[PDB]
Amino acid sequence: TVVSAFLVPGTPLPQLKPEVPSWGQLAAATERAGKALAASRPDVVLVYSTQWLAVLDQQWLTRPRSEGVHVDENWYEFGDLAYDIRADTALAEACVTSSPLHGVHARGVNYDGFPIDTGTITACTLMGIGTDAFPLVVGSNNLYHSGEITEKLAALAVDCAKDQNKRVAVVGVGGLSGSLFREEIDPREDRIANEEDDKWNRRVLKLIEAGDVSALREAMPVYAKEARVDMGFKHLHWILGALKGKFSGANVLGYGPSYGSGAAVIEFRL
């Protein structure tokens, strides 16, 4: 049922200011991942973003159609973020019901003007997703959830997609190393904060390319701590859980900086 898999950046800087060459490349690479997405002919898109924060219990987006203009609470000077996002209401509501059976309290989320996070929006815009052709089943990033639980959450959704007989594209939205610069820089001279962050990204990115699930699995908890990886890399656990801890190789379409932070676009070879 899972026919496609991707990891993309949840930073808005590539979409907002693609005139910066490195960010321009990140944007181009997320767009190229969109063609690869479409060509896989999915019915639903299993989306997880690191910026969709929940605390009480697991939240699933159940609102048929969400639209508006989002302003990033950090990057509001580089423009706005219009969005029009469709949801697979049947899958989402099923995910809500399937959730407490697997040991995770969940609730559907359907409210007018509910804030969809920057990550989900930028990946929709750039990848051309969340349209009526490719609706979403977005799961929140609960702060108290572990990568274990996140994997269980993604799996649970693939299995909910199986008995509705639907083709699934998986997208985990989030960054790599998270050493954000703490002063304002010239965006044209944005680079990766350290070389330690750079080497770590390069390394774990190479383990993704080779598809060494086992070496990746053990590098993950150390990498997450040592490179301040966006939310402990739970947006990769999402992709692993969706593929039930198994994938061949992978393809890296882009890797650059986002204000000292590491960002990358990865197409997964199933």
Partner 1 sequence: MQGEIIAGFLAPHPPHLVYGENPPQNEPRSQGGWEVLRWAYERARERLDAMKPDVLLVHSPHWITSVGHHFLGVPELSGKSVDPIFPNVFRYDFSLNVDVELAEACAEEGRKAGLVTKMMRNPKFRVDYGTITTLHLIRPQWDIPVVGISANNSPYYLNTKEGMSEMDVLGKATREAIRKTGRKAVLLASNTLSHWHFHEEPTIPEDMSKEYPATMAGYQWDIRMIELMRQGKTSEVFKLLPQFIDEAFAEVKSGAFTWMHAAMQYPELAAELFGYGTVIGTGNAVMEWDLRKAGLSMLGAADQ
The tokens of 267 are what? 């197409």
The Cα 30–Cα 248 span in angstroms is 21
State the DSSP H helix or E strand holding residue 252, giving kind and residue range, or none if neither. strand 249-258
In the complex with partner 1, which residue's Cβ is closer, 80 or 226? 80
In the complex with partner 1, which residue's Cβ is closer, 71 or 222? 71
DSSP classification of residue 115: -
Q: How far is the CB of 200 from partner 1 (least distance, A)?
A: 17
In the complex with partner 1, which residue's Cβ is closer, 28 or 180? 180
The tokens of 4 are what? 């496609």
Sort strands 2-8 and 168-173 into parallel, antiparallel or unpaired: parallel
Binding site for partner 1 (CB under 8 A): 52-57, 69-71, 73-74, 76-77, 80, 105, 109, 111-115, 117, 144, 180-184, 228, 259
The Cα 268–Cα 258 span in angstroms is 22
Say if residues 173 and 131 touch (Cβ distance below 8 Å).
Answer: no
Q: How far is the CB of 191 from partner 1 (least distance, A)?
A: 16
Q: How far is the CB of 33 from partner 1 (least distance, A)?
A: 26
Contacts of 174 (CB under 8 A, 6+ apart): 7, 9, 10, 49, 50, 51, 119, 230, 231, 233, 234, 235
In the complex with partner 1, which residue's Cβ is closer, 73 or 132? 73
Nearest CA to 236 among 198, 197, 199, 262? 262
Sort strands 261-269 and 44-54 into parallel, antiparallel or unpaired: unpaired
In the complex with partner 1, which residue's Cβ is closer, 88 or 117? 117
In the complex with partner 1, which residue's Cβ is closer, 57 or 159? 57
Q: How far is the CB of 178 from partner 1 (least distance, A)?
A: 9
In the complex with partner 1, which residue's Cβ is closer, 97 or 164? 97
Q: How far is the CB of 79 from partner 1 (least distance, A)?
A: 8
Nearest CA to 169 among 229, 119, 127, 106? 127
The tokens of 172 are what? 């985990």
Rounded-to-10 torsion of CA 78, 84, 89, 92: -10
Q: How far is the CB of 262 from partner 1 (least distance, A)?
A: 14
Helical spans, DSSP H, in 71-113: 89-98
Q: How far is the CB of 67 from partner 1 (least distance, A)?
A: 13
Contacts of 206 (CB under 8 A, 6+ apart): none
In the complex with partner 1, which residue's Cβ is closer, 61 or 266? 61
Q: How far is the CB of 74 from partner 1 (least distance, A)?
A: 6
